[PDB]
Write an enzyme that holds these catalytic residues in place. Structure first.
Site, PDB file in Angstrom:
ATOM      1  N   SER A 109     -23.371  26.344  27.367  1.00  0.00           N
ATOM      2  CA  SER A 109     -22.127  27.030  27.732  1.00  0.00           C
ATOM      3  C   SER A 109     -22.304  27.693  29.092  1.00  0.00           C
ATOM      4  O   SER A 109     -22.597  26.961  30.062  1.00  0.00           O
ATOM      5  CB  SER A 109     -21.731  27.951  26.583  1.00  0.00           C
ATOM      6  OG  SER A 109     -20.363  28.272  26.719  1.00  0.00           O
ATOM      7  N   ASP A 225     -14.237  21.555  20.274  1.00  0.00           N
ATOM      8  CA  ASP A 225     -14.621  22.758  20.994  1.00  0.00           C
ATOM      9  C   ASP A 225     -13.365  23.375  21.597  1.00  0.00           C
ATOM     10  O   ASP A 225     -12.715  22.764  22.450  1.00  0.00           O
ATOM     11  CB  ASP A 225     -15.643  22.367  22.064  1.00  0.00           C
ATOM     12  CG  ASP A 225     -16.260  23.567  22.769  1.00  0.00           C
ATOM     13  OD1 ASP A 225     -15.659  24.657  22.743  1.00  0.00           O
ATOM     14  OD2 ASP A 225     -17.344  23.389  23.383  1.00  0.00           O
ATOM     15  N   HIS A 255     -17.859  24.676  19.274  1.00  0.00           N
ATOM     16  CA  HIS A 255     -18.527  24.912  20.555  1.00  0.00           C
ATOM     17  C   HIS A 255     -20.047  24.845  20.431  1.00  0.00           C
ATOM     18  O   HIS A 255     -20.709  24.115  21.180  1.00  0.00           O
ATOM     19  CB  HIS A 255     -18.078  26.273  21.085  1.00  0.00           C
ATOM     20  CG  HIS A 255     -18.630  26.617  22.430  1.00  0.00           C
ATOM     21  ND1 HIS A 255     -18.533  25.770  23.513  1.00  0.00           N
ATOM     22  CD2 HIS A 255     -19.269  27.724  22.871  1.00  0.00           C
ATOM     23  CE1 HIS A 255     -19.109  26.338  24.562  1.00  0.00           C
ATOM     24  NE2 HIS A 255     -19.542  27.533  24.203  1.00  0.00           N
TER      25      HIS A 255
HETATM   26  O1  LIG Z   1     -21.235  31.098  27.371  1.00  0.00           O
HETATM   27  C1  LIG Z   1     -20.348  31.072  26.525  1.00  0.00           C
HETATM   28  C2  LIG Z   1     -18.920  31.011  26.992  1.00  0.00           C
HETATM   29  C3  LIG Z   1     -17.990  30.206  26.344  1.00  0.00           C
HETATM   30  C4  LIG Z   1     -16.696  30.128  26.805  1.00  0.00           C
HETATM   31  C5  LIG Z   1     -16.313  30.804  27.960  1.00  0.00           C
HETATM   32  C6  LIG Z   1     -14.923  30.747  28.371  1.00  0.00           C
HETATM   33  C7  LIG Z   1     -13.910  29.886  28.144  1.00  0.00           C
HETATM   34  N1  LIG Z   1     -12.765  30.339  28.776  1.00  0.00           N
HETATM   35  C8  LIG Z   1     -13.122  31.446  29.366  1.00  0.00           C
HETATM   36  C9  LIG Z   1     -12.271  32.343  30.136  1.00  0.00           C
HETATM   37  C10 LIG Z   1     -10.918  32.055  30.274  1.00  0.00           C
HETATM   38  C11 LIG Z   1     -10.099  32.922  30.974  1.00  0.00           C
HETATM   39  C12 LIG Z   1     -10.616  34.077  31.526  1.00  0.00           C
HETATM   40  C13 LIG Z   1     -11.967  34.361  31.402  1.00  0.00           C
HETATM   41  O2  LIG Z   1     -12.414  35.579  31.977  1.00  0.00           O
HETATM   42  C14 LIG Z   1     -13.063  35.523  33.115  1.00  0.00           C
HETATM   43  F1  LIG Z   1     -12.243  35.128  34.080  1.00  0.00           F
HETATM   44  F2  LIG Z   1     -14.084  34.695  33.039  1.00  0.00           F
HETATM   45  F3  LIG Z   1     -13.522  36.700  33.482  1.00  0.00           F
HETATM   46  C15 LIG Z   1     -12.798  33.513  30.687  1.00  0.00           C
HETATM   47  O3  LIG Z   1     -14.435  31.767  29.170  1.00  0.00           O
HETATM   48  C16 LIG Z   1     -17.249  31.589  28.632  1.00  0.00           C
HETATM   49  C17 LIG Z   1     -18.554  31.649  28.182  1.00  0.00           C
HETATM   50  N2  LIG Z   1     -20.624  31.263  25.224  1.00  0.00           N
HETATM   51  C18 LIG Z   1     -19.652  31.465  24.130  1.00  0.00           C
HETATM   52  C19 LIG Z   1     -20.474  32.253  23.129  1.00  0.00           C
HETATM   53  C20 LIG Z   1     -21.806  31.527  23.202  1.00  0.00           C
HETATM   54  O4  LIG Z   1     -21.669  30.243  22.604  1.00  0.00           O
HETATM   55  C21 LIG Z   1     -21.996  31.356  24.706  1.00  0.00           C
END
Ligand SMILES: O=C(c1ccc(-c2cnc(-c3cccc(OC(F)(F)F)c3)o2)cc1)N1CC[C@@H](O)C1
Length: 278
Positions: A109, A225, A255
């Protein structure tokens, strides 16, 4: 049996970076350097390290700055290079300790975005790359309004919250969601501007920089996902320079493919792929 040793190093800004080294009781066949995603930490990867260890692989896994056991303001970052610099230090530690071993860089991710960004900057510093649902097209997921907010605010006020995510989409397994929500080391707040800026730095440059990635590449992605749409991985594998690139799509998985009920099959696939290409 694979044993865990906990160590630390001084990251960018003299932040304390905690990392695990997982060592199997067999001659090491290669070294895996693993980057977790946003809000989590390396101890959500015990079973991954243990499965890789049964294949003779040594796994190094850090808690990024602002995550888990490491120091720094929680989920605070101003630039993707903070994360990739600390990842680079861990690769260098692994390189110095196992100089006769091929190096596999593995990210999930946001950690897959970190590993991708590292991998296009230092394409001769590793041998194989494995990505789980890599966050390499965040610009498709961030609305125009918070993309502006994140890019204008992300270095001045990187801690400013700009968006919330549905953690219940990390897995089909309620036990995984429950354990995530009760984990004291996990970040339970909103996504801040600095993270947004770093995510956009990766996603905006991915098509132009992906041709520099020529090492063999395995991407894993659940088709259901809802946090990182699989279309981003489909685009990634079309942009990389690698001739040996595969996207394994897992129908129905959410995911966190490594935490899903089918995770032992996913990990069998990874181990089989690594076995062929080491
Ligand atoms: O690393 C990840 C992760 C997964 C998904 C997203 C994701 C998807 N859509 C956005 C997103 C969308 C709009 C604004 C936003 O806010 C920001 F503009 F970014 F400030 C962020 O973020 C980010 C990180 N994970 C999930 C938990 C573990 O599995 C590890």
């Amino acid at each position: 049996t694979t044993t865990r040793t906990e160590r630390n190093f001084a990251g960018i800004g003299d932040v304390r970076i905690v990392y695990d080294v997982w060592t199997p009781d067999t001659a090491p066949q290669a070294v895996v350097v693993l980057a977790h995603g946003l809000g989590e930490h390396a101890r959500r990867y015990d079973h991954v390290a243990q499965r890789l260890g049964a294949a003779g692989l040594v796994t190094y896994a850090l808690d990024h700055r602002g995550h888990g056991r490491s120091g720094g303001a929680r989920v605070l970052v101003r630039d993707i290079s903070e994360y990739t610099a600390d990842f680079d230090t861990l690769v260098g530690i692994a390189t110095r300790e196992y100089p006769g071993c091929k190096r596999i860089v593995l990210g999930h991710s946001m950690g897959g975005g970190i590993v991708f960004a590292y991998g296009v900057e230092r394409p001769d510093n590793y041998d194989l790359m494995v990505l789980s649902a890599p966050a390499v097209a965040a610009q498709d997921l961030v609305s125009p309004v918070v993309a502006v907010a994140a890019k204008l605010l992300g270095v001045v006020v990187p801690g400013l919250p700009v968006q919330e995510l549905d953690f219940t989409a990390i897995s089909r397994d309620p036990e995984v969601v429950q354990a995530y929500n009760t984990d004291p080391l996990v970040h339970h707040g909103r996504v801040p501007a600095g993270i947004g800026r770093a995510l956009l730095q990766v996603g905006e440059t991915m098509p132009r920089r992906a041709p520099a990635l020529t090492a063999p590449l395995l991407v894993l992605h659940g088709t259901d996902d809802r946090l990182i749409p699989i279309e981003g991985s489909r685009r990634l594998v079309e942009c990389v320079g690698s001739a040996d690139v595969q996207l394994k799509e897992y129908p129905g998985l959410y995911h966190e493919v490594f935490n899903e009920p089918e995770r032992n099959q996913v990990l069998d696939d990874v181990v089989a792929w690594l076995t062929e290409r080491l």
